[PDB]
């Protein structure tokens, strides 16, 4: 993908005590046009891995296809071996770097959340192959507008509960609705815990516009 066409904006993610919660708004924009307004930018990989993605949505649908067929082909063996969130993250790092090195990138920026062996996983992969793991992730303009709130809470309190992380994710999505012009007031929140991956949505933000009357 030399030129992205229908892109998705910021995807958040934060580890809490017992899992990871990620969110993504349900909009795919063609340029500035909010053209595709009910598309899910969060994949359930398997029981213990979930994946939200930015960038080109056709490339994310490709990665959904390839990675879901990998999960199917793994579960056919029945041998008790599952792809870990770190394994999905490493496969996806290899995929994005391999497409980078052919000068044909997948125009995506992905958050891989997961929970295996009682340990949370949260992993960033972008179109160049730059991968790392962190207690809070945010792609797009979330790296500018949501990662401050996320990292200040994770500075004061390193271990969040699921309710605190859910409220923090909602609060950053409200900020990204206020300040990011490609965001949208309809988002999914995906959680992976010991109970598996649940995808909740569509969720909306509580808007405040009291500053609109403060102009005189």
């Amino acid at each position: 993908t030399q030129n992205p066409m229908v892109t998705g904006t910021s995807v958040l993610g934060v580890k809490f005590e017992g899992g990871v919660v990620i969110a993504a708004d349900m909009l795919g924009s063609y340029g500035s046009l909010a053209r595709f307004r009910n598309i899910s930018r969060i994949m359930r990989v398997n029981n213990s891995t979930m994946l939200g993605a930015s960038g080109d949505y056709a490339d994310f649908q490709y990665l959904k296809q390839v990675l879901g067929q990998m999960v199917i082909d793994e579960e056919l063996l029945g041998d008790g071996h599952s792809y870990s969130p770190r394994a999905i993250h490493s496969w996806l790092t290899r995929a994005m770097y391999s497409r980078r090195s052919k000068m044909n990138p997948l125009w995506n920026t992905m958050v891989i959340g997961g929970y295996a062996d009682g340990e949370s996983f949260l992993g960033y992969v972008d179109m160049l192959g730059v991968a790392y793991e962190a207690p809070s992730l945010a792609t797009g303009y979330g790296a500018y507008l949501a990662q401050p709130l996320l990292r200040e809470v994770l500075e004061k309190q390193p271990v969040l509960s699921q309710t605190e992380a859910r409220d923090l994710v909602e609060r950053c999505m409200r900020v990204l609705y206020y300040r990011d012009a490609r965001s949208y007031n309809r988002f999914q929140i995906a959680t992976v815990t010991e109970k598996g991956v649940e995808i909740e949505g569509p969720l909306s933000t509580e808007t405040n516009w009291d500053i609109a009357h403060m102009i005189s």
């Binding site: 063996l77 041998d79 008790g80 071996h81 490493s90």
Partner: protein
């Protein structure tokens, strides 16, 4: 005298429903020296007996490293075991490179069997005249796999391949009811007593002919050679 119309190539079925080249390659493993593999709940031990071309030669290797968690032992054509080691080492490297995790041992064994079925069905190519005995440790615990020249692979509690390894299987089936609860040293001594019973009456397990390969939970795959089998053999009993 009794010359056979059907044991010419591997792509010929006999009218008895059999493929004789596969069957004849199945006893290329009884042309190899004996090897016992056995697993506990935490460890998987490959014990092999190796032989020397002369008293001045140095005892052909039988346990081979494949990864940090997978180590195999061979019986049969050591030229085919080299093809199989190169293949298996590269598959272990490929999935430690792509997925950054060790192989499931059963997936590598399935992948070996899919490799070795191909010369059992295509013309002008012989079956692999080696049987492997594959110790590994992964998320599902330790594993002992047998692969045969028939491209059929076996998940084993304990196994012996090689020449006159029936007697080890008579030992191992008798004593497999206590392999899982062993520690490391008793599991190695069970493997040695299985290997010691694939011997004639005048022969004994020495430091030169015994090679021991152990993988475990907090242990990478390590081959214990000449000086290193002395802790494992100087705790056994005299031959009964």
């Amino acid at each position: 005298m009794f010359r056979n119309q059907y044991d010419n190539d591997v792509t010929v079925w006999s009218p008895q429903g059999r493929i004789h080249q596969i069957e004849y390659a199945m006893e290329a493993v009884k042309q190899g020296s004996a090897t016992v593999g056995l697993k506990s709940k935490t460890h998987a031990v490959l014990v092999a007996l190796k032989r020397a071309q002369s008293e001045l030669a140095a005892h052909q290797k039988k346990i081979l490293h494949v990864d940090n968690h997978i180590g195999i032992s061979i019986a049969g054509l050591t030229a085919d075991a080299r093809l199989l080691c190169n293949f298996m080492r590269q598959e272990c490297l490929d999935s430690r490179f792509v997925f950054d995790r060790p192989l499931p041992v059963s997936r590598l064994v399935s992948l070996i069997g899919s490799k070795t079925q191909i010369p059992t069905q295509r013309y002008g190519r012989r079956p692999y005249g080696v049987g492997l005995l594959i110790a590994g440790y992964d998320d599902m615990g330790p594993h002992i796999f047998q692969t045969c020249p028939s491209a059929n692979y076996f998940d084993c509690r304990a196994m012996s391949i090689g020449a006159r390894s029936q007697s080890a299987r008579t030992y191992l089936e008798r004593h497999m009811s206590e392999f899982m609860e062993c520690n490391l040293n008793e599991l190695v001594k069970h493997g040695l007593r299985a290997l010691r019973e694939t011997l004639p009456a005048e022969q004994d397990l020495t430091t030169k002919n015994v090679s021991i390969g152990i993988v475990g939970k907090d242990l990478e795959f390590t081959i214990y050679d000449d000086d290193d089998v002395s802790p494992f053999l100087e705790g056994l009993e005299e031959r009964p």
